[PDB]
C-alpha cells in the first residue's frame, strides 16, 4: 500500500509487498518396455527406433495429461487440479485459481476479463476437443454459430482475439484461458529424458528404460482462469 495520508505530518510505516512461493515438485514419467532381443534383430524396420518414438509420443500424451489434470500424487499438478474459486484476484488465495460457474456464450468474455490487462496480451486459450466442439456448437439464440464464422470457414484461429489451442486431456466441460508463460511453469531436469537400453540384465531381452523428470505448477495464479460450462 502507498499511504498518501497527511502531507504535513510524520509519514506512516506502509505495509510491505507480500511474496508467495510455488513448490513445483518434479516426478518421473517412465516407460519400461521389456522388448525381446529377437524382435530387435529380426525386424527390418529398426523396431527400437519405432519403440522409442512411440514412447516419446506417449510421453507427450502423459505430459499433457499430468500438466492438465494431474492430481498431484507424485505427478505434475495440472492447473485444473489446483483448487478453484469464484472470487476475484484481490480476494482469492494465491493457491487457488479463479473459476467461472455459469448456470449462451457470455461466460467466456467474463473469463477473459478475469485476467488483468497485461495478461491478455500473451493470453492463450486451452480447450478440450469436446469443449471446442461445444464452443463451436454454442449457437446464437438466432441459431447461427457465434464463435465460428460459419460452417464454411472452419476452425477459427482465435476465440477472443487470442490464439486458441486444443488440449486432448482436458475435461469434457472445462475450458481455460491464461498467459501460461506466466501462469504455469513446466519444469524439466537438466538430464532431460534419459534413455538406457538395458540389454544386460535379462539377456535375450533389451529393456528400454526411458524416464523424464517432469514437473508442473501454477505460477502466478492470477494468470490462469477456468470456465466450467454446464455438464448438460
Amino acid at each position: 500500500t502507498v499511504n498518501h495520508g497527511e502531507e504535513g505530518k510524520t509519514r506512516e510505516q506502509t505495509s510491505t509487498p507480500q511474496i508467495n512461493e510455488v513448490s513445483i515438485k518434479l516426478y518421473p514419467v517412465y516407460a519400461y518396455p521389456r522388448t525381446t532381443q529377437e524382435i530387435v534383430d529380426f525386424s527390418d524396420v529398426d523396431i527400437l527406433s519405432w519403440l522409442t518414438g512411440e514412447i516419446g509420443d506417449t510421453f507427450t500424451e502423459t505430459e499433457e495429461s499430468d500438466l492438465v489434470v494431474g492430481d498431484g500424487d507424485k505427478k505434475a499438478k495440472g492447473f485444473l487440479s489446483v483448487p478453484r474459486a469464484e472470487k476475484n484476484d484481490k480476494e482469492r488465495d494465491f493457491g487457488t485459481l479463479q473459476v467461472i460457474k455459469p448456470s449462451s456464450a457470455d461466460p467466456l468474455i467474463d473469463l477473459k476479463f478475469a485476467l488483468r490487462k497485461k495478461y491478455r496480451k500473451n493470453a492463450v486459450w486451452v480447450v478440450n476437443s469436446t469443449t471446442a466442439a461445444k464452443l463451436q456448437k454454442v449457437k446464437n439464440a438466432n441459431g447461427d454459430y457465434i464463435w465460428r464464422d460459419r460452417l464454411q470457414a472452419g476452425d477459427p484461429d482465435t476465440l477472443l482475439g487470442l490464439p486458441v489451442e486444443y488440449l486432448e486431456f482436458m475435461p469434457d466441460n472445462v475450458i481455460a484461458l491464461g498467459d501460461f508463460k506466466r501462469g504455469y511453469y513446466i519444469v524439466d531436469h537438466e538430464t532431460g529424458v534419459r534413455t538406457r537400453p538395458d540389454n544386460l540384465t535379462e539377456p535375450g531381452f533389451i529393456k528400454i528404460f526411458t524416464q523424464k523428470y517432469l514437473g508442473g505448477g501454477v505460477v502466478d495464479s492470477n494468470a490462469i482462469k477456468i470456465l466450467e460450462l454446464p455438464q448438460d
Binding site: 511474496i19 513448490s23 488483468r116 490487462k117 497485461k118 506466466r182 502466478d220 492470477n222
Partner: protein, 48 residues
C-alpha cells in the same frame, strides 16, 4: 533423512513482478512538470 536433505530446492533468483496497468492516466491526461507545489490553470467560465 537418507539423502532427502541432500535435495536443495532450486529457487529462482529473479522474482517475477506483478504486471501493473501500463500507467494509463499519464498517457491519457495531459502531464505537467512544474517546479512548484501548485499548478493554477486559468479557465474561461463563460458568463459573457
Amino acid at each position: 533423512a537418507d539423502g532427502g536433505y541432500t535435495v536443495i530446492p532450486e529457487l529462482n533468483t529473479e522474482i517475477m513482478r506483478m504486471l501493473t496497468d501500463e500507467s494509463t492516466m499519464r498517457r491519457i491526461c495531459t502531464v505537467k512538470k512544474i517546479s512548484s507545489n501548485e499548478f493554477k490553470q486559468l479557465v474561461s467560465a463563460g458568463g459573457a
